[PDB]
């Protein structure tokens, strides 16, 4: 028995299995940063901080004794609660195949968006700098028309090459940029084909962010330390409802600031 | 001996084999919904209903006894009769290779169209909601010109992604939409190539429906329960004719309403 | 873990065992229809309907396509709640042998009476016709005095024989009829001996119904389809009480209406 008091929830095994399957599907659909950043294996519930290797000079304890304090980044925990009606839970065992998991899907969307925004744009309260605001390269603005995308991608790739970064290059685009680049052109220009000739993979769809980002996936530039992966826990239940939550525990660090170019949304 | 009183029909074995081959060919050509929906193995002649897992509160039998009634969807049977002239049947054994099976082909077309319309647009009398009218996403209107098809397909794909549905994405188009998208453009735009870059398969041709539909084929969203597959039975014969019928037995349910976007015919 | 959230109940194993033993004893004492009707093995929580084999003509889907809908009888669920004081539950482990299970016995009586009344007199809301109202034979009125019982039993047996039904013949009597026929006569007439010479078993005592019924137990005339047998589930608990319920899931059909004669209470 762990802190996720699952056995105390009035939820049958079949309902638990269906809920877990739905949560996994929605999370894989909505999670974007994990596709481009180095994600470690879960460290456990006792994982609290990651040391940065740097020190801070302190006032000495006394006679000719010098003191330095080690620096570390703390781990932040995200929790999003949702409520189920207990009727879907009871119907799963009766044989229902269309039980309503909309609150679970909304909670998954919220937690995935929070994680993606923390990784990309940063979360000041948790001490997470963010991939984009912590970039030493000059940001590039995306064009209104999809025809100008190859030029901007080429300039960003040139920025990476001049900075000296190697390895495969991947771009993550927001919802608007992704739909604009996938809709196509009215002049018959194979802009998608040119983009795929330039890039080293598939465009990553990120509903949580705006604009985009081009980054190298050689490894060792963006570290996501995971203590607890996204899991489902139980809070309380009523005669007609059950309250659950989605919880994750992680920290993120940007080690190389030259391996990333941030693309700003079109104006 | 079963309810299809085949042995009572004045039809030779060679004629039966040719008729079955023609019916199978025409049915595979005309059946479209089975390519995109989950089709189960036949359940048998005694398959009458499929339970939905839900209940309805009833007035109690008496002193402090509560009652709920289980809900199920009944199975509907489709039968289409046709007439053969007995001259083709007699000529098959004499060696004919061009016997007239036009009534059989027309009956196959009718029954396939009825099944496809029930699955896609719904059949109220049998309790079948239908794929398109039971969609929670906003329907999209197809453009008059094939050049605008990639944009509409991209918007529908974005709707699926925002709803959180995963898996391969397939589009089914009516006859007009299919012929318009396959005829091409007068500006040399590779619209078919762009469409095939966006989609996860081949466009499904559906002569029975108008407009189109984009849906995910991950599995578990559209259930077709089959009790009796399409089979040939005998009714009566005259000195110069034999009356047969094509019969099927099925029910259909749409379990996930967010995994489908309906495309409306161009105006 | 199933829909009967037993493990969430603050009830020890010894208390659970005693409660189950008491419930089984009281249910075997009070259940009467199961002694004379064909009872199937439990079908499971997903059992929702039983097909009758009949069809209903529908309005056609379109051009020369005929449609029929299969007919089925839904399964009804009965639930009766009761409350225990938690003091008996705590005392069972302390060694109590006279714990108060009166609410459980009352709930068992209520649910058994509801089931028996649904089987014999019918339950319109659940679609259960009932054994007695769905009888094609002419009902017979019981006499006020036990001396006239053999004559009525003989007439009912003659009705069965003329209808052509075979097999053992059993009579189920209400509480008043049973006590009247067992009290005896003041003239020394062995009416019970004559009744047992006529009948093919022991008189079934039915506290839930009035009058009586004479029916053949050859098999295949009265079908009780059981999805979930009577079981104990947990709802909620207080600091001084625990709320449980008795739940069953079944449907009943009378297939042969000539194998039953209904005896009406004496006037």
Tab-separated table of N, CA and C in Angstrom, chain C residues 60-204:
chain	number	residue	atom	x	y	z
C	60	UNK	N	-39.172	-0.532	-43.950
C	60	UNK	CA	-37.969	-0.850	-44.680
C	60	UNK	C	-36.974	0.289	-44.738
C	61	UNK	N	-35.685	-0.051	-44.769
C	61	UNK	CA	-34.658	0.991	-44.921
C	61	UNK	C	-34.750	1.744	-46.234
C	62	UNK	N	-35.332	1.144	-47.270
C	62	UNK	CA	-35.380	1.786	-48.567
C	62	UNK	C	-35.897	0.913	-49.691
C	63	UNK	N	-35.161	0.872	-50.798
C	63	UNK	CA	-35.625	0.245	-52.034
C	63	UNK	C	-35.643	-1.271	-51.885
C	64	UNK	N	-36.835	-1.826	-51.655
C	64	UNK	CA	-37.091	-3.266	-51.667
C	64	UNK	C	-36.269	-4.025	-50.632
C	65	UNK	N	-35.854	-3.365	-49.557
C	65	UNK	CA	-35.143	-4.017	-48.465
C	65	UNK	C	-36.108	-4.166	-47.298
C	66	UNK	N	-36.313	-5.401	-46.857
C	66	UNK	CA	-37.173	-5.689	-45.728
C	66	UNK	C	-36.366	-5.835	-44.452
C	67	UNK	N	-36.971	-5.435	-43.337
C	67	UNK	CA	-36.293	-5.427	-42.051
C	67	UNK	C	-37.182	-6.022	-40.970
C	68	UNK	N	-36.594	-6.880	-40.141
C	68	UNK	CA	-37.251	-7.408	-38.954
C	68	UNK	C	-36.299	-7.260	-37.776
C	69	UNK	N	-36.860	-6.958	-36.611
C	69	UNK	CA	-36.105	-6.742	-35.385
C	69	UNK	C	-36.297	-7.935	-34.460
C	70	UNK	N	-35.195	-8.467	-33.939
C	70	UNK	CA	-35.270	-9.589	-33.014
C	70	UNK	C	-35.844	-9.138	-31.677
C	71	UNK	N	-36.561	-10.039	-31.011
C	71	UNK	CA	-37.187	-9.735	-29.733
C	71	UNK	C	-36.475	-10.461	-28.599
C	72	UNK	N	-36.322	-9.765	-27.476
C	72	UNK	CA	-35.668	-10.337	-26.312
C	72	UNK	C	-36.326	-9.795	-25.054
C	73	UNK	N	-36.147	-10.533	-23.963
C	73	UNK	CA	-36.614	-10.131	-22.648
C	73	UNK	C	-35.430	-9.640	-21.833
C	74	UNK	N	-35.495	-8.431	-21.285
C	74	UNK	CA	-34.376	-7.913	-20.494
C	74	UNK	C	-34.306	-8.556	-19.119
C	75	UNK	N	-33.136	-8.440	-18.513
C	75	UNK	CA	-32.882	-8.948	-17.173
C	75	UNK	C	-33.118	-7.824	-16.177
C	76	UNK	N	-33.760	-8.146	-15.057
C	76	UNK	CA	-34.048	-7.170	-14.017
C	76	UNK	C	-33.174	-7.471	-12.806
C	77	UNK	N	-32.758	-6.407	-12.126
C	77	UNK	CA	-31.935	-6.494	-10.927
C	77	UNK	C	-32.745	-6.028	-9.726
C	78	UNK	N	-32.724	-6.822	-8.662
C	78	UNK	CA	-33.401	-6.505	-7.413
C	78	UNK	C	-32.360	-6.239	-6.336
C	79	UNK	N	-32.526	-5.135	-5.610
C	79	UNK	CA	-31.632	-4.766	-4.520
C	79	UNK	C	-32.453	-4.363	-3.305
C	80	UNK	N	-32.107	-4.921	-2.144
C	80	UNK	CA	-32.775	-4.616	-0.888
C	80	UNK	C	-31.716	-4.247	0.143
C	81	UNK	N	-31.709	-3.026	0.669
C	81	UNK	CA	-30.703	-2.648	1.665
C	81	UNK	C	-31.139	-2.909	3.100
C	82	UNK	N	-30.138	-3.105	3.956
C	82	UNK	CA	-30.342	-3.290	5.386
C	82	UNK	C	-29.150	-2.711	6.139
C	83	UNK	N	-29.343	-2.489	7.437
C	83	UNK	CA	-28.359	-1.824	8.286
C	83	UNK	C	-28.050	-2.713	9.482
C	84	UNK	N	-26.764	-2.851	9.796
C	84	UNK	CA	-26.296	-3.539	10.989
C	84	UNK	C	-25.647	-2.538	11.939
C	85	UNK	N	-25.614	-2.892	13.223
C	85	UNK	CA	-25.255	-1.957	14.285
C	85	UNK	C	-23.767	-1.933	14.615
C	86	UNK	N	-22.956	-2.758	13.954
C	86	UNK	CA	-21.504	-2.815	14.120
C	86	UNK	C	-21.109	-3.410	15.466
C	87	UNK	N	-22.052	-3.469	16.403
C	87	UNK	CA	-21.785	-4.093	17.689
C	87	UNK	C	-21.816	-5.606	17.576
C	88	UNK	N	-22.774	-6.142	16.817
C	88	UNK	CA	-22.769	-7.567	16.515
C	88	UNK	C	-21.526	-7.952	15.725
C	89	UNK	N	-21.134	-7.112	14.765
C	89	UNK	CA	-19.955	-7.390	13.953
C	89	UNK	C	-18.706	-7.436	14.825
C	90	UNK	N	-18.573	-6.484	15.752
C	90	UNK	CA	-17.421	-6.493	16.645
C	90	UNK	C	-17.480	-7.647	17.638
C	91	UNK	N	-18.683	-8.047	18.059
C	91	UNK	CA	-18.823	-9.111	19.045
C	91	UNK	C	-18.565	-10.492	18.460
C	92	UNK	N	-18.766	-10.670	17.151
C	92	UNK	CA	-18.508	-11.976	16.543
C	92	UNK	C	-17.075	-12.420	16.807
C	93	UNK	N	-16.109	-11.516	16.630
C	93	UNK	CA	-14.718	-11.880	16.877
C	93	UNK	C	-14.426	-12.041	18.361
C	94	UNK	N	-15.131	-11.303	19.215
C	94	UNK	CA	-15.016	-11.487	20.655
C	94	UNK	C	-15.660	-12.782	21.128
C	95	UNK	N	-16.383	-13.475	20.256
C	95	UNK	CA	-16.910	-14.786	20.567
C	95	UNK	C	-18.413	-14.887	20.655
C	96	UNK	N	-19.143	-13.870	20.211
C	96	UNK	CA	-20.594	-13.891	20.305
C	96	UNK	C	-21.182	-14.965	19.398
C	97	UNK	N	-22.193	-15.664	19.912
C	97	UNK	CA	-22.924	-16.661	19.148
C	97	UNK	C	-24.384	-16.285	18.939
C	98	UNK	N	-24.830	-15.153	19.478
C	98	UNK	CA	-26.209	-14.695	19.356
C	98	UNK	C	-26.248	-13.259	18.853
C	99	UNK	N	-25.449	-12.967	17.832
C	99	UNK	CA	-25.461	-11.643	17.229
C	99	UNK	C	-26.767	-11.407	16.479
C	100	UNK	N	-27.211	-10.152	16.482
C	100	UNK	CA	-28.513	-9.787	15.933
C	100	UNK	C	-28.403	-9.615	14.422
C	101	UNK	N	-28.957	-10.567	13.670
C	101	UNK	CA	-29.027	-10.489	12.215
C	101	UNK	C	-30.464	-10.305	11.731
C	102	UNK	N	-31.312	-9.714	12.572
C	102	UNK	CA	-32.703	-9.484	12.190
C	102	UNK	C	-32.863	-8.609	10.951
C	103	UNK	N	-32.132	-7.497	10.780
C	103	UNK	CA	-32.249	-6.761	9.510
C	103	UNK	C	-31.886	-7.599	8.297
C	104	UNK	N	-30.863	-8.448	8.415
C	104	UNK	CA	-30.496	-9.321	7.307
C	104	UNK	C	-31.608	-10.316	7.003
C	105	UNK	N	-32.224	-10.880	8.044
C	105	UNK	CA	-33.318	-11.822	7.828
C	105	UNK	C	-34.519	-11.136	7.185
C	106	UNK	N	-34.827	-9.909	7.610
C	106	UNK	CA	-35.925	-9.166	6.997
C	106	UNK	C	-35.635	-8.846	5.535
C	107	UNK	N	-34.398	-8.453	5.224
C	107	UNK	CA	-34.037	-8.184	3.836
C	107	UNK	C	-34.135	-9.445	2.986
C	108	UNK	N	-33.695	-10.581	3.531
C	108	UNK	CA	-33.812	-11.842	2.807
C	108	UNK	C	-35.271	-12.187	2.545
C	109	UNK	N	-36.130	-12.000	3.549
C	109	UNK	CA	-37.553	-12.258	3.362
C	109	UNK	C	-38.132	-11.360	2.277
C	110	UNK	N	-37.772	-10.073	2.297
C	110	UNK	CA	-38.296	-9.139	1.305
C	110	UNK	C	-37.863	-9.520	-0.105
C	111	UNK	N	-36.579	-9.830	-0.289
C	111	UNK	CA	-36.094	-10.122	-1.635
C	111	UNK	C	-36.654	-11.451	-2.134
C	112	UNK	N	-36.777	-12.446	-1.248
C	112	UNK	CA	-37.371	-13.715	-1.655
C	112	UNK	C	-38.836	-13.541	-2.027
C	113	UNK	N	-39.575	-12.741	-1.255
C	113	UNK	CA	-40.960	-12.479	-1.596
C	113	UNK	C	-41.105	-11.750	-2.917
C	114	UNK	N	-40.229	-10.778	-3.174
C	114	UNK	CA	-40.272	-10.061	-4.444
C	114	UNK	C	-40.005	-11.001	-5.613
C	115	UNK	N	-38.992	-11.862	-5.481
C	115	UNK	CA	-38.686	-12.811	-6.547
C	115	UNK	C	-39.842	-13.777	-6.779
C	116	UNK	N	-40.417	-14.307	-5.697
C	116	UNK	CA	-41.511	-15.262	-5.835
C	116	UNK	C	-42.740	-14.613	-6.456
C	117	UNK	N	-43.059	-13.383	-6.048
C	117	UNK	CA	-44.206	-12.693	-6.626
C	117	UNK	C	-43.975	-12.376	-8.096
C	118	UNK	N	-42.751	-11.988	-8.462
C	118	UNK	CA	-42.454	-11.747	-9.870
C	118	UNK	C	-42.604	-13.021	-10.690
C	119	UNK	N	-42.147	-14.152	-10.153
C	119	UNK	CA	-42.211	-15.401	-10.907
C	119	UNK	C	-43.650	-15.889	-11.038
C	120	UNK	N	-44.427	-15.822	-9.956
C	120	UNK	CA	-45.764	-16.408	-9.951
C	120	UNK	C	-46.820	-15.450	-10.498
C	121	UNK	N	-46.941	-14.265	-9.903
C	121	UNK	CA	-47.974	-13.316	-10.291
C	121	UNK	C	-47.516	-12.321	-11.347
C	122	UNK	N	-46.235	-12.292	-11.677
C	122	UNK	CA	-45.761	-11.418	-12.739
C	122	UNK	C	-45.336	-10.055	-12.234
C	123	UNK	N	-44.424	-9.437	-12.982
C	123	UNK	CA	-43.936	-8.086	-12.706
C	123	UNK	C	-43.961	-7.327	-14.028
C	124	UNK	N	-44.952	-6.445	-14.185
C	124	UNK	CA	-45.199	-5.813	-15.478
C	124	UNK	C	-44.049	-4.907	-15.900
C	125	UNK	N	-43.458	-4.176	-14.953
C	125	UNK	CA	-42.416	-3.215	-15.301
C	125	UNK	C	-41.197	-3.894	-15.910
C	126	UNK	N	-40.839	-5.077	-15.423
C	126	UNK	CA	-39.701	-5.818	-15.946
C	126	UNK	C	-40.052	-6.678	-17.151
C	127	UNK	N	-41.320	-6.715	-17.553
C	127	UNK	CA	-41.723	-7.539	-18.672
C	127	UNK	C	-41.932	-8.999	-18.351
C	128	UNK	N	-42.091	-9.348	-17.079
C	128	UNK	CA	-42.292	-10.733	-16.667
C	128	UNK	C	-43.789	-11.008	-16.602
C	129	UNK	N	-44.256	-11.942	-17.433
C	129	UNK	CA	-45.677	-12.244	-17.469
C	129	UNK	C	-46.187	-12.892	-16.196
C	130	UNK	N	-45.456	-13.863	-15.676
C	130	UNK	CA	-45.884	-14.587	-14.496
C	130	UNK	C	-46.473	-15.943	-14.837
C	131	UNK	N	-46.313	-16.890	-13.912
C	131	UNK	CA	-46.781	-18.254	-14.150
C	131	UNK	C	-48.304	-18.307	-14.182
C	132	UNK	N	-48.954	-17.687	-13.203
C	132	UNK	CA	-50.399	-17.816	-13.049
C	132	UNK	C	-51.184	-16.984	-14.064
C	133	UNK	N	-50.921	-15.680	-14.221
C	133	UNK	CA	-51.714	-14.903	-15.190
C	133	UNK	C	-51.520	-15.341	-16.630
C	134	UNK	N	-50.434	-16.049	-16.941
C	134	UNK	CA	-50.151	-16.511	-18.293
C	134	UNK	C	-50.512	-17.979	-18.490
C	135	UNK	N	-51.548	-18.454	-17.806
C	135	UNK	CA	-51.981	-19.840	-17.906
C	135	UNK	C	-53.204	-19.936	-18.809
C	136	UNK	N	-53.171	-20.881	-19.751
C	136	UNK	CA	-54.287	-21.064	-20.668
C	136	UNK	C	-55.399	-21.928	-20.086
C	137	UNK	N	-55.138	-22.638	-18.992
C	137	UNK	CA	-56.162	-23.455	-18.363
C	137	UNK	C	-57.079	-22.598	-17.499
C	138	UNK	N	-58.252	-23.140	-17.205
C	138	UNK	CA	-59.227	-22.429	-16.386
C	138	UNK	C	-58.829	-22.501	-14.916
C	139	UNK	N	-58.734	-21.369	-14.221
C	139	UNK	CA	-58.358	-21.403	-12.805
C	139	UNK	C	-59.426	-22.066	-11.948
C	140	UNK	N	-58.976	-22.682	-10.858
C	140	UNK	CA	-59.851	-23.399	-9.940
C	140	UNK	C	-59.780	-22.765	-8.560
C	141	UNK	N	-60.930	-22.634	-7.905
C	141	UNK	CA	-61.004	-21.997	-6.597
C	141	UNK	C	-60.871	-23.042	-5.495
C	142	UNK	N	-60.024	-22.755	-4.508
C	142	UNK	CA	-59.818	-23.688	-3.412
C	142	UNK	C	-61.010	-23.655	-2.457
C	143	UNK	N	-61.354	-24.779	-1.839
C	143	UNK	CA	-62.470	-24.795	-0.889
C	143	UNK	C	-62.051	-24.302	0.489
C	144	UNK	N	-63.058	-23.911	1.271
C	144	UNK	CA	-62.804	-23.418	2.622
C	144	UNK	C	-62.336	-24.548	3.532
C	145	UNK	N	-62.883	-25.747	3.352
C	145	UNK	CA	-62.557	-26.891	4.191
C	145	UNK	C	-61.537	-27.783	3.496
C	146	UNK	N	-60.648	-28.381	4.291
C	146	UNK	CA	-59.608	-29.244	3.743
C	146	UNK	C	-60.169	-30.519	3.131
C	147	UNK	N	-61.418	-30.871	3.444
C	147	UNK	CA	-62.008	-32.087	2.894
C	147	UNK	C	-62.197	-31.991	1.385
C	148	UNK	N	-62.474	-30.795	0.868
C	148	UNK	CA	-62.686	-30.613	-0.554
C	148	UNK	C	-61.434	-30.463	-1.388
C	149	UNK	N	-60.261	-30.433	-0.757
C	149	UNK	CA	-59.013	-30.288	-1.503
C	149	UNK	C	-58.758	-31.429	-2.482
C	150	UNK	N	-58.942	-32.709	-2.123
C	150	UNK	CA	-58.676	-33.773	-3.110
C	150	UNK	C	-59.488	-33.638	-4.386
C	151	UNK	N	-60.740	-33.189	-4.290
C	151	UNK	CA	-61.562	-33.025	-5.484
C	151	UNK	C	-60.982	-31.965	-6.415
C	152	UNK	N	-60.582	-30.821	-5.856
C	152	UNK	CA	-60.018	-29.746	-6.669
C	152	UNK	C	-58.697	-30.186	-7.287
C	153	UNK	N	-57.877	-30.899	-6.512
C	153	UNK	CA	-56.607	-31.393	-7.036
C	153	UNK	C	-56.850	-32.369	-8.181
C	154	UNK	N	-57.857	-33.234	-8.035
C	154	UNK	CA	-58.189	-34.183	-9.092
C	154	UNK	C	-58.652	-33.468	-10.355
C	155	UNK	N	-59.483	-32.435	-10.202
C	155	UNK	CA	-59.940	-31.683	-11.369
C	155	UNK	C	-58.778	-30.985	-12.068
C	156	UNK	N	-57.856	-30.410	-11.294
C	156	UNK	CA	-56.691	-29.766	-11.896
C	156	UNK	C	-55.808	-30.780	-12.620
C	157	UNK	N	-55.617	-31.957	-12.021
C	157	UNK	CA	-54.845	-33.007	-12.677
C	157	UNK	C	-55.513	-33.448	-13.971
C	158	UNK	N	-56.844	-33.537	-13.965
C	158	UNK	CA	-57.571	-33.866	-15.184
C	158	UNK	C	-57.379	-32.790	-16.243
C	159	UNK	N	-57.354	-31.522	-15.831
C	159	UNK	CA	-57.094	-30.442	-16.779
C	159	UNK	C	-55.722	-30.598	-17.423
C	160	UNK	N	-54.704	-30.897	-16.613
C	160	UNK	CA	-53.369	-31.131	-17.163
C	160	UNK	C	-53.371	-32.303	-18.141
C	161	UNK	N	-54.004	-33.413	-17.753
C	161	UNK	CA	-54.010	-34.600	-18.603
C	161	UNK	C	-54.722	-34.336	-19.924
C	162	UNK	N	-55.857	-33.637	-19.880
C	162	UNK	CA	-56.583	-33.312	-21.101
C	162	UNK	C	-55.772	-32.365	-21.974
C	163	UNK	N	-55.088	-31.391	-21.369
C	163	UNK	CA	-54.177	-30.547	-22.129
C	163	UNK	C	-53.014	-31.331	-22.713
C	164	UNK	N	-52.735	-32.522	-22.193
C	164	UNK	CA	-51.713	-33.366	-22.773
C	164	UNK	C	-50.351	-33.243	-22.142
C	165	UNK	N	-50.257	-32.608	-20.986
C	165	UNK	CA	-48.981	-32.430	-20.307
C	165	UNK	C	-48.662	-33.685	-19.510
C	166	UNK	N	-47.387	-34.046	-19.478
C	166	UNK	CA	-46.902	-35.239	-18.802
C	166	UNK	C	-45.951	-34.829	-17.679
C	167	UNK	N	-45.287	-35.823	-17.097
C	167	UNK	CA	-44.268	-35.580	-16.106
C	167	UNK	C	-44.837	-35.475	-14.710
C	168	UNK	N	-43.958	-35.339	-13.718
C	168	UNK	CA	-44.424	-35.206	-12.335
C	168	UNK	C	-45.246	-33.941	-12.150
C	169	UNK	N	-46.222	-34.020	-11.253
C	169	UNK	CA	-47.124	-32.912	-10.967
C	169	UNK	C	-46.896	-32.456	-9.534
C	170	UNK	N	-46.610	-31.169	-9.359
C	170	UNK	CA	-46.353	-30.587	-8.053
C	170	UNK	C	-47.315	-29.435	-7.809
C	171	UNK	N	-47.734	-29.278	-6.558
C	171	UNK	CA	-48.565	-28.148	-6.169
C	171	UNK	C	-47.801	-27.271	-5.189
C	172	UNK	N	-47.906	-25.966	-5.399
C	172	UNK	CA	-47.374	-24.954	-4.500
C	172	UNK	C	-48.559	-24.255	-3.857
C	173	UNK	N	-48.556	-24.175	-2.532
C	173	UNK	CA	-49.655	-23.584	-1.785
C	173	UNK	C	-49.157	-22.385	-0.994
C	174	UNK	N	-50.020	-21.388	-0.845
C	174	UNK	CA	-49.728	-20.261	0.011
C	174	UNK	C	-49.726	-20.678	1.469
C	175	UNK	N	-49.439	-19.706	2.336
C	175	UNK	CA	-49.337	-20.009	3.760
C	175	UNK	C	-50.669	-20.490	4.324
C	176	UNK	N	-51.764	-19.805	3.981
C	176	UNK	CA	-53.072	-20.181	4.507
C	176	UNK	C	-53.496	-21.557	4.011
C	177	UNK	N	-53.352	-21.804	2.707
C	177	UNK	CA	-53.732	-23.099	2.155
C	177	UNK	C	-52.876	-24.217	2.734
C	178	UNK	N	-51.572	-23.973	2.878
C	178	UNK	CA	-50.679	-24.984	3.431
C	178	UNK	C	-51.047	-25.315	4.870
C	179	UNK	N	-51.291	-24.290	5.693
C	179	UNK	CA	-51.631	-24.567	7.084
C	179	UNK	C	-53.001	-25.224	7.201
C	180	UNK	N	-53.946	-24.873	6.323
C	180	UNK	CA	-55.250	-25.526	6.356
C	180	UNK	C	-55.148	-26.993	5.960
C	181	UNK	N	-54.342	-27.302	4.941
C	181	UNK	CA	-54.242	-28.685	4.488
C	181	UNK	C	-53.398	-29.515	5.449
C	182	UNK	N	-52.529	-28.877	6.234
C	182	UNK	CA	-51.715	-29.623	7.186
C	182	UNK	C	-52.347	-29.739	8.567
C	183	UNK	N	-53.268	-28.840	8.923
C	183	UNK	CA	-53.921	-28.930	10.225
C	183	UNK	C	-54.733	-30.213	10.344
C	184	UNK	N	-55.427	-30.588	9.283
C	184	UNK	CA	-56.185	-31.821	9.251
C	184	UNK	C	-57.680	-31.565	9.287
C	185	UNK	N	-58.418	-32.643	9.536
C	185	UNK	CA	-59.869	-32.614	9.577
C	185	UNK	C	-60.360	-33.118	10.927
C	186	UNK	N	-61.564	-32.681	11.292
C	186	UNK	CA	-62.216	-33.102	12.522
C	186	UNK	C	-63.060	-34.353	12.328
C	187	UNK	N	-63.048	-34.935	11.127
C	187	UNK	CA	-63.786	-36.158	10.837
C	187	UNK	C	-62.855	-37.347	10.621
C	188	UNK	N	-61.554	-37.163	10.835
C	188	UNK	CA	-60.609	-38.251	10.670
C	188	UNK	C	-60.346	-38.655	9.239
C	189	UNK	N	-60.580	-37.766	8.286
C	189	UNK	CA	-60.335	-38.084	6.882
C	189	UNK	C	-58.856	-37.914	6.556
C	190	UNK	N	-58.192	-38.923	5.987
C	190	UNK	CA	-56.768	-38.784	5.604
C	190	UNK	C	-56.599	-38.009	4.300
C	191	UNK	N	-56.986	-36.730	4.348
C	191	UNK	CA	-56.911	-35.886	3.161
C	191	UNK	C	-55.467	-35.693	2.724
C	192	UNK	N	-54.535	-35.575	3.674
C	192	UNK	CA	-53.129	-35.444	3.309
C	192	UNK	C	-52.624	-36.698	2.609
C	193	UNK	N	-53.031	-37.873	3.095
C	193	UNK	CA	-52.635	-39.119	2.449
C	193	UNK	C	-53.197	-39.215	1.037
C	194	UNK	N	-54.460	-38.824	0.848
C	194	UNK	CA	-55.037	-38.837	-0.493
C	194	UNK	C	-54.321	-37.851	-1.414
C	195	UNK	N	-54.004	-36.662	-0.897
C	195	UNK	CA	-53.298	-35.661	-1.689
C	195	UNK	C	-51.940	-36.194	-2.121
C	196	UNK	N	-51.231	-36.858	-1.205
C	196	UNK	CA	-49.917	-37.392	-1.538
C	196	UNK	C	-49.998	-38.597	-2.463
C	197	UNK	N	-51.103	-39.343	-2.432
C	197	UNK	CA	-51.320	-40.354	-3.460
C	197	UNK	C	-51.514	-39.722	-4.830
C	198	UNK	N	-52.207	-38.584	-4.892
C	198	UNK	CA	-52.435	-37.937	-6.182
C	198	UNK	C	-51.181	-37.258	-6.728
C	199	UNK	N	-50.413	-36.583	-5.875
C	199	UNK	CA	-49.323	-35.728	-6.334
C	199	UNK	C	-48.030	-36.529	-6.414
C	200	UNK	N	-47.032	-35.941	-7.072
C	200	UNK	CA	-45.743	-36.580	-7.317
C	200	UNK	C	-44.618	-35.944	-6.503
C	201	UNK	N	-44.897	-35.583	-5.254
C	201	UNK	CA	-43.864	-35.033	-4.397
C	201	UNK	C	-44.378	-34.497	-3.077
C	202	UNK	N	-43.702	-33.483	-2.546
C	202	UNK	CA	-44.114	-32.806	-1.325
C	202	UNK	C	-44.698	-31.445	-1.675
C	203	UNK	N	-45.705	-31.020	-0.908
C	203	UNK	CA	-46.303	-29.711	-1.136
C	203	UNK	C	-45.270	-28.632	-0.848
C	204	UNK	N	-45.150	-27.676	-1.761
C	204	UNK	CA	-44.192	-26.585	-1.625
C	204	UNK	C	-44.870	-25.439	-0.888
